[PDB]
Nucleic acid binder design. Structure first.
Lengths: 471, 50
RNA sequence: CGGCACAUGCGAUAUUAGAAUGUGGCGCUCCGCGGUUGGUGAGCAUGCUCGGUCCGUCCGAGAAGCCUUAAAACUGCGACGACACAUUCACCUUGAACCAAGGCGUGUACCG
Protein backbone atom coordinates (compact mmCIF):
# COMPACT_ATOMS: atom_id res chain seq x y z
CA UNK A 1 0.00 0.00 0.00
CA UNK A 2 1.12 3.55 -0.73
CA UNK A 3 -0.35 5.53 2.28
CA UNK A 4 2.75 7.74 2.64
CA UNK A 5 2.14 8.54 6.30
CA UNK A 6 2.66 4.82 6.96
CA UNK A 7 5.78 4.83 4.80
CA UNK A 8 6.99 7.72 6.94
CA UNK A 9 6.29 5.74 10.13
CA UNK A 10 8.16 2.73 8.79
CA UNK A 11 11.03 4.95 7.64
CA UNK A 12 11.34 6.43 11.13
CA UNK A 13 10.43 3.29 13.07
CA UNK A 14 13.96 1.95 12.70
CA UNK A 15 15.34 4.85 14.74
CA UNK A 16 15.13 3.91 18.41
CA UNK A 17 14.55 6.04 21.48
CA UNK A 18 17.23 7.74 23.57
CA UNK A 19 18.20 7.21 27.17
CA UNK A 20 18.22 10.23 29.47
CA UNK A 21 22.03 10.44 29.28
CA UNK A 22 22.45 10.04 25.52
CA UNK A 23 20.79 13.42 25.06
CA UNK A 24 23.51 14.99 27.24
CA UNK A 25 26.11 13.09 25.20
CA UNK A 26 24.70 14.45 21.92
CA UNK A 27 24.61 17.92 23.49
CA UNK A 28 28.28 17.54 24.42
CA UNK A 29 29.03 16.59 20.82
CA UNK A 30 27.22 19.81 19.85
CA UNK A 31 29.43 21.68 22.33
CA UNK A 32 32.50 20.06 20.76
CA UNK A 33 31.34 21.16 17.32
CA UNK A 34 30.73 24.78 18.26
CA UNK A 35 34.00 24.69 20.24
CA UNK A 36 35.91 23.61 17.15
CA UNK A 37 34.28 26.15 14.85
CA UNK A 38 34.99 28.96 17.33
CA UNK A 39 38.58 27.73 17.63
CA UNK A 40 38.71 27.75 13.83
CA UNK A 41 37.60 31.39 14.02
CA UNK A 42 40.27 31.86 16.72
CA UNK A 43 43.17 31.42 14.25
CA UNK A 44 41.79 33.81 11.58
CA UNK A 45 42.83 37.42 12.31
CA UNK A 46 40.74 39.14 9.63
CA UNK A 47 37.44 38.15 11.28
CA UNK A 48 38.89 39.44 14.59
CA UNK A 49 39.78 42.84 13.12
CA UNK A 50 36.45 42.94 11.27
CA UNK A 51 34.56 42.65 14.54
CA UNK A 52 36.97 45.21 16.01
CA UNK A 53 35.93 47.68 13.30
CA UNK A 54 32.29 46.79 14.00
CA UNK A 55 32.91 47.51 17.68
CA UNK A 56 34.36 50.89 16.72
CA UNK A 57 31.05 51.36 14.93
CA UNK A 58 29.53 50.47 18.32
CA UNK A 59 31.70 53.11 20.03
CA UNK A 60 30.83 55.68 17.32
CA UNK A 61 27.11 55.65 18.35
CA UNK A 62 26.07 54.01 15.06
CA UNK A 63 25.31 50.64 16.67
CA UNK A 64 23.98 49.28 19.96
CA UNK A 65 24.93 46.88 22.75
CA UNK A 66 22.22 44.53 21.44
CA UNK A 67 23.53 44.56 17.85
CA UNK A 68 27.09 43.21 17.87
CA UNK A 69 27.22 40.62 20.67
CA UNK A 70 25.18 39.74 23.75
CA UNK A 71 26.48 38.66 27.14
CA UNK A 72 29.85 37.94 28.73
CA UNK A 73 31.29 35.24 30.98
CA UNK A 74 31.14 37.40 34.15
CA UNK A 75 26.45 42.79 29.34
CA UNK A 76 26.88 46.04 31.25
CA UNK A 77 28.14 48.98 29.14
CA UNK A 78 30.91 49.68 31.65
CA UNK A 79 31.67 45.95 31.51
CA UNK A 80 31.72 46.19 27.70
CA UNK A 81 34.09 49.17 28.00
CA UNK A 82 36.51 47.43 30.35
CA UNK A 83 36.49 44.02 28.62
CA UNK A 84 36.93 45.54 25.18
CA UNK A 85 39.57 47.88 26.62
CA UNK A 86 41.52 44.84 27.82
CA UNK A 87 40.87 43.39 24.34
CA UNK A 88 42.14 46.68 22.85
CA UNK A 89 45.37 46.48 24.85
CA UNK A 90 45.67 42.81 23.86
CA UNK A 91 45.43 43.39 20.12
CA UNK A 92 47.72 46.39 20.18
CA UNK A 93 50.29 44.31 22.07
CA UNK A 94 49.63 41.12 20.07
CA UNK A 95 49.77 41.83 16.33
CA UNK A 96 53.02 43.83 16.24
CA UNK A 97 55.20 40.99 17.59
CA UNK A 98 55.60 39.19 14.25
CA UNK A 99 58.94 41.09 14.10
CA UNK A 100 57.10 34.22 14.43
CA UNK A 101 56.85 31.90 17.44
CA UNK A 102 57.05 34.79 19.92
CA UNK A 103 53.73 36.15 18.63
CA UNK A 104 51.88 32.82 18.48
CA UNK A 105 51.06 32.54 22.19
CA UNK A 106 49.94 36.19 22.09
CA UNK A 107 47.60 35.41 19.19
CA UNK A 108 46.31 32.41 21.17
CA UNK A 109 45.63 34.62 24.21
CA UNK A 110 43.86 37.18 21.99
CA UNK A 111 41.93 34.20 20.60
CA UNK A 112 40.96 33.03 24.10
CA UNK A 113 39.70 36.47 25.16
CA UNK A 114 37.89 36.63 21.82
CA UNK A 115 36.28 33.28 22.68
CA UNK A 116 35.26 34.81 26.05
CA UNK A 117 32.67 36.86 24.09
CA UNK A 118 29.16 35.55 23.38
CA UNK A 119 28.36 36.52 19.79
CA UNK A 120 25.16 37.20 17.87
CA UNK A 121 24.60 34.46 15.21
CA UNK A 122 24.33 37.16 12.52
CA UNK A 123 27.95 38.30 12.86
CA UNK A 124 29.10 34.72 13.62
CA UNK A 125 27.49 33.13 10.57
CA UNK A 126 28.66 36.14 8.54
CA UNK A 127 32.27 35.35 9.49
CA UNK A 128 31.68 31.64 8.78
CA UNK A 129 30.22 32.29 5.34
CA UNK A 130 32.95 34.83 4.55
CA UNK A 131 35.56 32.18 5.33
CA UNK A 132 33.58 29.83 3.08
CA UNK A 133 33.60 32.37 0.22
CA UNK A 134 37.35 32.94 0.68
CA UNK A 135 37.91 29.17 0.58
CA UNK A 136 35.75 28.88 -2.54
CA UNK A 137 37.81 31.55 -4.30
CA UNK A 138 41.02 29.72 -3.32
CA UNK A 139 39.60 26.40 -4.58
CA UNK A 140 38.45 28.18 -7.74
CA UNK A 141 42.02 29.30 -8.40
CA UNK A 142 43.37 25.80 -7.62
CA UNK A 143 40.86 24.09 -9.92
CA UNK A 144 41.56 26.81 -12.50
CA UNK A 145 45.28 25.97 -12.52
CA UNK A 146 44.35 22.27 -12.66
CA UNK A 147 42.00 22.76 -15.62
CA UNK A 148 44.67 24.84 -17.36
CA UNK A 149 47.56 22.39 -17.02
CA UNK A 150 46.51 18.90 -15.81
CA UNK A 151 43.78 17.84 -18.24
CA UNK A 152 44.90 19.82 -21.29
CA UNK A 153 48.69 19.49 -21.18
CA UNK A 154 48.39 15.91 -19.77
CA UNK A 155 50.37 16.77 -16.65
CA UNK A 156 49.90 14.18 -13.87
CA UNK A 157 48.23 15.32 -10.66
CA UNK A 158 50.97 13.68 -8.59
CA UNK A 159 53.58 15.93 -10.23
CA UNK A 160 51.12 18.80 -9.87
CA UNK A 161 50.71 18.26 -6.10
CA UNK A 162 54.45 17.47 -5.55
CA UNK A 163 55.90 20.97 -5.13
CA UNK A 164 52.53 22.78 -5.07
CA UNK A 165 51.02 21.12 -2.00
CA UNK A 166 53.82 21.72 0.47
CA UNK A 167 54.86 25.21 -0.56
CA UNK A 168 51.98 26.69 -2.67
CA UNK A 169 53.42 30.23 -2.23
CA UNK A 170 56.42 30.88 -4.46
CA UNK A 171 57.81 29.78 -7.84
CA UNK A 172 59.55 26.68 -6.41
CA UNK A 173 56.86 24.57 -8.08
CA UNK A 174 56.53 26.93 -11.05
CA UNK A 175 59.92 28.26 -12.11
CA UNK A 176 62.18 25.43 -10.95
CA UNK A 177 60.23 22.62 -12.65
CA UNK A 178 60.53 24.54 -15.91
CA UNK A 179 64.30 24.65 -15.32
CA UNK A 180 64.37 20.98 -14.23
CA UNK A 181 63.61 20.18 -17.91
CA UNK A 182 60.70 17.77 -17.62
CA UNK A 183 58.81 16.64 -20.76
CA UNK A 184 55.77 18.56 -19.46
CA UNK A 185 57.72 21.75 -18.69
CA UNK A 186 57.56 22.86 -22.34
CA UNK A 187 53.74 22.92 -22.37
CA UNK A 188 53.77 25.50 -19.56
CA UNK A 189 55.33 28.03 -21.94
CA UNK A 190 51.96 28.83 -23.53
CA UNK A 191 50.23 29.03 -20.13
CA UNK A 192 53.02 30.32 -17.84
CA UNK A 193 51.57 33.84 -17.65
CA UNK A 194 48.10 32.72 -16.52
CA UNK A 195 49.41 30.07 -14.10
CA UNK A 196 51.86 32.60 -12.69
CA UNK A 197 49.10 35.20 -12.39
CA UNK A 198 46.85 32.74 -10.54
CA UNK A 199 49.80 31.91 -8.28
CA UNK A 200 50.27 35.62 -7.58
CA UNK A 201 46.55 35.93 -6.82
CA UNK A 202 46.98 33.04 -4.38
CA UNK A 203 49.81 35.06 -2.83
CA UNK A 204 47.46 38.07 -2.83
CA UNK A 205 44.86 36.11 -0.84
CA UNK A 206 47.68 35.12 1.54
CA UNK A 207 48.73 38.77 1.93
CA UNK A 208 45.14 39.79 2.68
CA UNK A 209 44.78 37.38 5.61
CA UNK A 210 48.47 37.51 6.58
CA UNK A 211 49.13 33.75 6.64
CA UNK A 212 49.57 31.20 3.89
CA UNK A 213 47.03 28.76 2.48
CA UNK A 214 49.10 26.05 4.22
CA UNK A 215 47.48 27.38 7.41
CA UNK A 216 44.13 28.45 5.93
CA UNK A 217 43.32 25.00 4.50
CA UNK A 218 43.84 23.39 7.90
CA UNK A 219 41.79 26.16 9.56
CA UNK A 220 38.73 25.66 7.43
CA UNK A 221 38.95 21.87 7.17
CA UNK A 222 38.99 21.95 10.98
CA UNK A 223 35.92 24.19 10.79
CA UNK A 224 34.28 21.84 8.28
CA UNK A 225 34.91 18.71 10.34
CA UNK A 226 33.67 20.40 13.52
CA UNK A 227 30.52 21.62 11.82
CA UNK A 228 29.94 18.21 10.22
CA UNK A 229 30.25 16.63 13.67
CA UNK A 230 27.71 19.12 15.02
CA UNK A 231 25.33 18.53 12.12
CA UNK A 232 25.55 14.74 12.50
CA UNK A 233 24.76 15.10 16.21
CA UNK A 234 21.77 17.32 15.48
CA UNK A 235 20.55 14.92 12.77
CA UNK A 236 20.75 12.12 15.32
CA UNK A 237 18.76 14.04 17.94
CA UNK A 238 16.06 15.04 15.42
CA UNK A 239 15.76 11.44 14.18
CA UNK A 240 15.32 10.45 17.82
CA UNK A 241 12.69 13.02 18.74
CA UNK A 242 10.34 12.65 15.75
CA UNK A 243 8.05 10.75 18.18
CA UNK A 244 7.38 13.93 20.17
CA UNK A 245 6.27 15.68 16.99
CA UNK A 246 3.81 12.86 16.28
CA UNK A 247 2.44 12.83 19.83
CA UNK A 248 1.86 16.58 19.73
CA UNK A 249 0.45 16.67 16.20
CA UNK A 250 -2.19 14.05 16.99
CA UNK A 251 -4.26 16.82 18.56
CA UNK A 252 -4.53 19.47 15.83
CA UNK A 253 -5.53 17.13 12.99
CA UNK A 254 -9.08 18.22 12.25
CA UNK A 255 -8.35 21.96 12.30
CA UNK A 256 -8.16 22.05 8.48
CA UNK A 257 -4.55 21.18 7.67
CA UNK A 258 -3.47 17.65 6.73
CA UNK A 259 -1.70 15.30 9.13
CA UNK A 260 1.69 15.15 7.42
CA UNK A 261 1.70 18.93 7.00
CA UNK A 262 1.32 19.18 10.77
CA UNK A 263 4.15 16.78 11.50
CA UNK A 264 6.47 18.48 9.00
CA UNK A 265 5.85 21.88 10.55
CA UNK A 266 6.48 20.19 13.87
CA UNK A 267 9.76 18.83 12.56
CA UNK A 268 10.81 22.33 11.54
CA UNK A 269 9.94 23.47 15.06
CA UNK A 270 11.89 20.53 16.48
CA UNK A 271 14.95 21.49 14.46
CA UNK A 272 14.62 25.02 15.82
CA UNK A 273 14.46 23.50 19.31
CA UNK A 274 17.64 21.48 18.71
CA UNK A 275 19.21 24.74 17.53
CA UNK A 276 18.26 26.61 20.69
CA UNK A 277 18.53 23.77 23.23
CA UNK A 278 20.53 24.28 26.43
CA UNK A 279 21.02 21.27 28.68
CA UNK A 280 22.80 23.13 31.49
CA UNK A 281 19.47 24.46 32.74
CA UNK A 282 18.80 20.82 33.63
CA UNK A 283 15.41 20.37 32.01
CA UNK A 284 14.75 17.38 29.80
CA UNK A 285 14.66 17.90 26.05
CA UNK A 286 10.91 17.21 26.01
CA UNK A 287 9.81 20.11 28.23
CA UNK A 288 11.83 22.62 26.23
CA UNK A 289 11.08 21.26 22.76
CA UNK A 290 7.32 20.86 23.22
CA UNK A 291 6.73 24.62 23.28
CA UNK A 292 8.70 25.15 20.06
CA UNK A 293 6.84 22.34 18.29
CA UNK A 294 3.44 23.64 19.41
CA UNK A 295 4.46 27.18 18.47
CA UNK A 296 5.48 26.19 14.94
CA UNK A 297 2.36 24.06 14.45
CA UNK A 298 -0.03 26.73 15.77
CA UNK A 299 1.68 29.42 13.68
CA UNK A 300 1.42 27.19 10.61
CA UNK A 301 -2.28 26.45 11.14
CA UNK A 302 -2.88 30.16 11.56
CA UNK A 303 -0.75 30.91 8.48
CA UNK A 304 -1.60 28.51 5.71
CA UNK A 305 -4.73 26.47 6.50
CA UNK A 306 -7.24 28.99 5.10
CA UNK A 307 -8.09 30.15 1.58
CA UNK A 308 -8.35 33.79 2.60
CA UNK A 309 -5.29 34.21 4.80
CA UNK A 310 -6.47 35.77 8.04
CA UNK A 311 -3.72 36.90 10.43
CA UNK A 312 -2.60 35.56 13.78
CA UNK A 313 -4.36 37.92 16.20
CA UNK A 314 -7.56 37.69 14.16
CA UNK A 315 -7.52 33.90 14.56
CA UNK A 316 -6.84 34.39 18.27
CA UNK A 317 -9.99 36.53 18.41
CA UNK A 318 -11.97 33.87 16.52
CA UNK A 319 -10.78 31.15 18.88
CA UNK A 320 -11.71 33.34 21.85
CA UNK A 321 -15.19 33.73 20.38
CA UNK A 322 -15.59 29.98 19.93
CA UNK A 323 -14.26 29.30 23.45
CA UNK A 324 -16.50 31.86 25.15
CA UNK A 325 -19.50 30.79 23.08
CA UNK A 326 -18.71 27.23 24.13
CA UNK A 327 -18.69 28.27 27.79
CA UNK A 328 -21.81 30.44 27.68
CA UNK A 329 -23.86 27.85 25.79
CA UNK A 330 -23.86 25.60 28.84
CA UNK A 331 -24.38 28.57 31.18
CA UNK A 332 -27.37 30.30 29.58
CA UNK A 333 -28.69 27.37 27.56
CA UNK A 334 -30.09 28.58 24.24
CA UNK A 335 -26.96 29.99 22.48
CA UNK A 336 -25.35 33.36 23.25
CA UNK A 337 -26.49 36.35 21.34
CA UNK A 338 -23.68 38.82 20.46
CA UNK A 339 -25.36 41.32 22.80
CA UNK A 340 -24.24 39.01 25.61
CA UNK A 341 -20.78 38.92 24.03
CA UNK A 342 -20.69 42.72 24.37
CA UNK A 343 -20.59 42.58 28.16
CA UNK A 344 -18.89 39.18 28.21
CA UNK A 345 -15.83 40.49 26.37
CA UNK A 346 -14.12 43.85 25.84
CA UNK A 347 -15.15 44.54 22.24
CA UNK A 348 -17.86 46.98 21.14
CA UNK A 349 -20.15 44.29 19.57
CA UNK A 350 -20.11 45.85 16.11
CA UNK A 351 -16.65 44.43 15.53
CA UNK A 352 -17.82 41.04 16.84
CA UNK A 353 -20.24 40.86 13.90
CA UNK A 354 -17.46 41.31 11.36
CA UNK A 355 -15.18 38.88 13.22
CA UNK A 356 -18.07 36.41 13.03
CA UNK A 357 -18.37 37.17 9.31
CA UNK A 358 -14.67 36.77 8.44
CA UNK A 359 -14.33 33.35 10.13
CA UNK A 360 -16.41 31.52 7.49
CA UNK A 361 -14.66 29.06 5.20
CA UNK A 362 -15.75 29.40 1.54
CA UNK A 363 -18.02 26.78 0.01
CA UNK A 364 -16.60 24.40 -2.54
CA UNK A 365 -18.02 25.36 -5.93
CA UNK A 366 -18.79 21.69 -6.52
CA UNK A 367 -20.76 21.31 -3.29
CA UNK A 368 -23.89 19.45 -4.43
CA UNK A 369 -27.30 20.95 -4.17
CA UNK A 370 -30.03 18.41 -3.35
CA UNK A 371 -31.02 15.07 -5.02
CA UNK A 372 -27.30 14.40 -5.88
CA UNK A 373 -27.73 15.15 -9.60
CA UNK A 374 -25.08 16.62 -11.90
CA UNK A 375 -26.40 19.95 -10.56
CA UNK A 376 -23.62 21.24 -8.34
CA UNK A 377 -23.29 24.75 -6.95
CA UNK A 378 -21.10 25.84 -9.86
CA UNK A 379 -23.86 25.69 -12.44
CA UNK A 380 -25.93 28.32 -10.62
CA UNK A 381 -23.39 31.12 -10.15
CA UNK A 382 -24.30 33.88 -12.58
CA UNK A 383 -21.72 36.10 -14.23
CA UNK A 384 -22.07 39.71 -13.10
CA UNK A 385 -18.98 41.02 -14.92
CA UNK A 386 -20.48 40.86 -18.41
CA UNK A 387 -22.55 43.64 -19.88
CA UNK A 388 -26.03 42.96 -21.19
CA UNK A 389 -26.24 43.04 -25.00
CA UNK A 390 -28.99 45.65 -24.86
CA UNK A 391 -26.47 48.03 -23.29
CA UNK A 392 -24.17 47.29 -26.21
CA UNK A 393 -27.02 48.15 -28.57
CA UNK A 394 -27.55 51.45 -26.73
CA UNK A 395 -23.83 52.21 -26.95
CA UNK A 396 -23.79 51.51 -30.69
CA UNK A 397 -26.86 53.65 -31.36
CA UNK A 398 -25.50 56.40 -29.12
CA UNK A 399 -22.19 56.51 -31.01
CA UNK A 400 -24.15 56.65 -34.28
CA UNK A 401 -26.40 59.47 -33.04
CA UNK A 402 -23.54 61.50 -31.57
CA UNK A 403 -21.53 61.11 -34.77
CA UNK A 404 -24.50 62.36 -36.79
CA UNK A 405 -24.97 65.31 -34.44
CA UNK A 406 -21.29 66.27 -34.37
CA UNK A 407 -21.36 66.12 -38.16
CA UNK A 408 -23.92 68.93 -37.99
CA UNK A 409 -21.58 71.35 -36.24
CA UNK A 410 -18.72 73.38 -37.71
CA UNK A 411 -15.17 72.14 -38.22
CA UNK A 412 -13.58 73.74 -35.17
CA UNK A 413 -16.48 73.02 -32.80
CA UNK A 414 -16.64 69.33 -33.74
CA UNK A 415 -12.84 69.01 -33.69
CA UNK A 416 -12.58 70.65 -30.25
CA UNK A 417 -15.46 68.61 -28.88
CA UNK A 418 -13.92 65.36 -30.12
CA UNK A 419 -10.48 66.37 -28.84
CA UNK A 420 -11.76 67.34 -25.40
CA UNK A 421 -13.61 64.10 -24.65
CA UNK A 422 -12.70 60.53 -25.46
CA UNK A 423 -14.49 60.56 -28.82
CA UNK A 424 -13.10 57.95 -31.32
CA UNK A 425 -9.44 58.61 -30.50
CA UNK A 426 -6.91 58.08 -27.72
CA UNK A 427 -6.91 59.88 -24.34
CA UNK A 428 -8.81 63.10 -23.79
CA UNK A 429 -7.06 66.45 -23.75
CA UNK A 430 -7.48 69.37 -21.38
CA UNK A 431 -7.41 73.16 -21.78
CA UNK A 432 -3.70 73.99 -21.94
CA UNK A 433 -3.10 70.83 -23.97
CA UNK A 434 -5.68 71.74 -26.63
CA UNK A 435 -4.17 75.23 -26.50
CA UNK A 436 -0.80 73.77 -27.41
CA UNK A 437 -2.57 71.73 -30.11
CA UNK A 438 -4.19 74.66 -31.93
CA UNK A 439 -1.77 77.45 -30.80
CA UNK A 440 -4.85 79.18 -29.42
CA UNK A 441 -5.93 80.87 -26.17
CA UNK A 442 -7.05 78.73 -23.20
CA UNK A 443 -10.08 80.91 -22.44
CA UNK A 444 -10.98 80.94 -26.15
CA UNK A 445 -11.28 77.14 -26.00
CA UNK A 446 -13.67 77.50 -23.06
CA UNK A 447 -15.70 80.06 -25.00
CA UNK A 448 -15.86 77.79 -28.07
CA UNK A 449 -16.80 74.90 -25.77
CA UNK A 450 -19.62 76.87 -24.15
CA UNK A 451 -20.85 78.01 -27.56
CA UNK A 452 -20.76 74.40 -28.81
CA UNK A 453 -22.76 73.12 -25.84
CA UNK A 454 -25.16 76.05 -26.26
CA UNK A 455 -25.56 74.97 -29.88
CA UNK A 456 -26.27 71.40 -28.75
CA UNK A 457 -28.82 72.23 -26.03
CA UNK A 458 -31.35 73.70 -28.47
CA UNK A 459 -34.07 71.43 -29.93
CA UNK A 460 -33.77 69.79 -33.38
CA UNK A 461 -30.42 68.60 -32.01
CA UNK A 462 -31.39 67.95 -28.40
CA UNK A 463 -34.25 65.57 -29.24
CA UNK A 464 -32.32 62.58 -30.54
CA UNK A 465 -29.80 62.87 -27.71
CA UNK A 466 -32.41 63.43 -24.99
CA UNK A 467 -33.94 60.17 -26.23
CA UNK A 468 -30.94 58.37 -24.65
CA UNK A 469 -32.01 59.44 -21.14
CA UNK A 470 -34.82 57.23 -19.87
CA UNK A 471 -37.39 58.26 -17.29
CA UNK B 1 -17.34 55.92 -21.77
CA UNK B 2 -16.83 58.50 -24.53
CA UNK B 3 -20.03 60.07 -25.94
CA UNK B 4 -22.05 58.91 -22.91
CA UNK B 5 -19.69 61.20 -20.96
CA UNK B 6 -20.27 63.75 -23.71
CA UNK B 7 -24.03 63.46 -23.22
CA UNK B 8 -23.73 63.76 -19.46
CA UNK B 9 -21.72 66.93 -20.01
CA UNK B 10 -24.34 68.27 -22.40
CA UNK B 11 -27.33 67.63 -20.14
CA UNK B 12 -25.65 67.80 -16.72
CA UNK B 13 -27.57 64.85 -15.29
CA UNK B 14 -25.74 63.25 -12.38
CA UNK B 15 -25.24 59.52 -12.66
CA UNK B 16 -26.63 58.56 -9.28
CA UNK B 17 -24.74 56.88 -6.46
CA UNK B 18 -27.27 54.05 -6.12
CA UNK B 19 -28.90 51.19 -8.02
CA UNK B 20 -32.41 49.74 -8.14
CA UNK B 21 -32.20 46.19 -6.82
CA UNK B 22 -35.81 46.10 -5.65
CA UNK B 23 -37.81 42.94 -5.10
CA UNK B 24 -40.09 42.35 -8.06
CA UNK B 25 -42.89 39.93 -8.91
CA UNK B 26 -41.65 37.01 -11.06
CA UNK B 27 -42.35 37.11 -14.76
CA UNK B 28 -45.97 36.32 -15.45
CA UNK B 29 -48.02 35.78 -12.31
CA UNK B 30 -50.66 37.85 -10.54
CA UNK B 31 -52.56 37.80 -7.29
CA UNK B 32 -52.93 39.46 -3.94
CA UNK B 33 -50.44 40.46 -1.25
CA UNK B 34 -51.93 38.87 1.85
CA UNK B 35 -49.18 38.87 4.48
CA UNK B 36 -46.07 40.98 4.99
CA UNK B 37 -43.36 40.30 7.58
CA UNK B 38 -40.40 42.48 8.54
CA UNK B 39 -37.53 40.75 10.35
CA UNK B 40 -34.98 43.23 11.69
CA UNK B 41 -31.68 42.79 13.49
CA UNK B 42 -31.72 44.20 17.02
CA UNK B 43 -29.75 47.43 17.21
CA UNK B 44 -31.00 48.75 13.86
CA UNK B 45 -33.64 51.46 13.43
CA UNK B 46 -37.05 49.95 12.78
CA UNK B 47 -38.94 51.90 10.15
CA UNK B 48 -42.58 52.92 10.27
CA UNK B 49 -44.26 49.87 8.76
CA UNK B 50 -42.23 47.56 11.00
C1' C C 1 -5.78 -24.89 -13.97
C1' G C 2 -5.92 -21.76 -9.34
C1' G C 3 -4.44 -17.18 -6.14
C1' C C 4 -3.21 -12.34 -5.20
C1' A C 5 -3.43 -7.41 -7.25
C1' C C 6 -4.87 -3.51 -10.35
C1' A C 7 -7.20 -0.94 -14.12
C1' U C 8 -11.58 0.25 -16.94
C1' G C 9 -16.93 0.61 -18.92
C1' C C 10 -22.18 1.00 -17.98
C1' G C 11 -25.49 2.21 -13.96
C1' A C 12 -30.74 6.92 -19.51
C1' U C 13 -31.73 12.19 -21.86
C1' A C 14 -34.58 16.22 -20.12
C1' U C 15 -37.28 18.97 -16.10
C1' U C 16 -36.66 20.10 -10.61
C1' A C 17 -4.16 25.88 26.40
C1' G C 18 -2.44 29.10 25.79
C1' A C 19 -2.09 33.91 28.36
C1' A C 20 0.59 38.42 28.78
C1' U C 21 4.48 42.14 27.60
C1' G C 22 7.93 45.15 24.95
C1' U C 23 10.84 46.94 20.83
C1' G C 24 11.80 47.74 15.87
C1' G C 25 11.13 49.11 11.23
C1' C C 26 7.56 48.87 6.83
C1' G C 27 3.27 50.38 3.70
C1' C C 28 0.40 47.22 -3.61
C1' U C 29 -3.69 51.21 3.42
C1' C C 30 -7.14 54.83 -0.78
C1' C C 31 -7.81 57.37 6.56
C1' G C 32 -6.98 63.66 8.87
C1' C C 33 -3.26 67.97 7.80
C1' G C 34 0.71 70.94 5.03
C1' G C 35 3.61 72.38 0.79
C1' U C 36 4.26 71.85 -5.01
C1' U C 37 3.19 71.63 -10.41
C1' G C 38 -1.17 71.74 -12.17
C1' G C 39 -7.98 72.70 -14.24
C1' U C 40 -13.82 73.29 -15.99
C1' G C 41 -20.16 70.83 -16.39
C1' A C 42 -19.93 79.35 -14.21
C1' G C 43 -21.63 83.86 -15.26
C1' C C 44 -22.16 84.39 -21.31
C1' A C 45 -30.16 82.14 -23.95
C1' U C 46 -25.21 87.31 -27.81
C1' G C 47 -21.49 90.46 -20.31
C1' C C 48 -18.46 92.79 -25.37
C1' U C 49 -17.45 93.82 -30.84
C1' C C 50 -18.80 93.06 -35.90
C1' G C 51 -21.63 90.69 -39.93
C1' G C 52 -26.66 87.75 -41.80
C1' U C 53 -31.64 87.72 -40.19
C1' C C 54 -36.71 84.30 -40.87
C1' C C 55 -35.21 89.25 -35.86
C1' G C 56 -34.88 91.87 -31.54
C1' U C 57 -34.48 85.81 -31.39
C1' C C 58 -31.46 82.65 -33.44
C1' C C 59 -26.86 81.88 -37.05
C1' G C 60 -20.97 83.28 -38.35
C1' A C 61 -16.19 85.43 -36.44
C1' G C 62 -13.31 87.81 -32.39
C1' A C 63 -11.10 89.83 -27.17
C1' A C 64 -11.09 90.27 -21.90
C1' G C 65 -11.66 89.94 -17.00
C1' C C 66 -13.37 88.21 -12.77
C1' C C 67 -14.17 82.83 -11.05
C1' U C 68 -14.61 77.07 -10.45
C1' U C 69 -7.19 74.34 -9.90
C1' A C 70 -4.82 70.73 -3.49
C1' A C 71 -9.36 67.82 -9.15
C1' A C 72 -4.88 64.60 -11.72
C1' A C 73 -0.19 64.01 -9.98
C1' C C 74 4.27 64.57 -6.35
C1' U C 75 6.41 64.96 -1.35
C1' G C 76 6.32 65.44 3.71
C1' C C 77 3.27 65.75 8.91
C1' G C 78 -0.96 62.55 11.85
C1' A C 79 -4.27 57.58 12.01
C1' C C 80 -4.60 52.79 10.74
C1' G C 81 -3.08 48.34 8.75
C1' A C 82 0.11 44.54 8.02
C1' C C 83 5.22 42.57 9.24
C1' A C 84 9.69 41.28 11.93
C1' C C 85 12.38 40.49 16.42
C1' A C 86 12.67 39.98 21.65
C1' U C 87 10.82 38.85 26.70
C1' U C 88 7.62 36.91 31.17
C1' C C 89 4.13 33.35 33.22
C1' A C 90 1.14 28.91 33.01
C1' C C 91 0.10 24.32 31.04
C1' C C 92 1.55 20.25 28.27
C1' U C 93 5.25 14.85 27.89
C1' U C 94 7.66 9.95 22.82
C1' G C 95 3.73 5.45 16.83
C1' A C 96 -3.43 9.20 14.81
C1' A C 97 -8.24 9.67 12.33
C1' C C 98 -11.25 7.83 8.67
C1' C C 99 -15.70 5.89 5.50
C1' A C 100 -17.97 2.23 3.14
C1' A C 101 -19.75 -2.67 2.37
C1' G C 102 -26.06 -6.32 -1.91
C1' G C 103 -25.67 -4.69 -9.78
C1' C C 104 -23.97 -6.03 -14.61
C1' G C 105 -19.47 -6.27 -17.87
C1' U C 106 -14.42 -5.88 -20.19
C1' G C 107 -9.28 -6.34 -19.59
C1' U C 108 -3.99 -6.32 -17.78
C1' A C 109 0.18 -7.57 -14.66
C1' C C 110 2.49 -11.06 -10.97
C1' C C 111 3.05 -16.08 -8.64
C1' G C 112 2.18 -21.08 -8.23
Amino acid sequence: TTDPVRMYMREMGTVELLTREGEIDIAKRIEDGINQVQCSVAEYPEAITYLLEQYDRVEAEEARLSDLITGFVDIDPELAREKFAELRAQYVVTRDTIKHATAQEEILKLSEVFKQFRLVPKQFDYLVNSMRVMMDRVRTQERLIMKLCVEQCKMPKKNFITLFTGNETSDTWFNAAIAMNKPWSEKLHDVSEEVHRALQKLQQIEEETGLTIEQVKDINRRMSIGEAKARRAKKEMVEANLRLVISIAKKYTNRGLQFLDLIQEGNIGLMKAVDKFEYRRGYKFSTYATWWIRQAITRSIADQARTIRIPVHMIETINKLNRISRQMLQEMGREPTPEELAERMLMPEDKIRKVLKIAKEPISMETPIGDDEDSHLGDFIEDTTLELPLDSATTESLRAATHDVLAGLTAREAKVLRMRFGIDMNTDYTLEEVGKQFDVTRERIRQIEAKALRKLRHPSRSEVLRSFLDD
Amino acid sequence: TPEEKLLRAIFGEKASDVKDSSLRVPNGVSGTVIDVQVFTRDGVEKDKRA
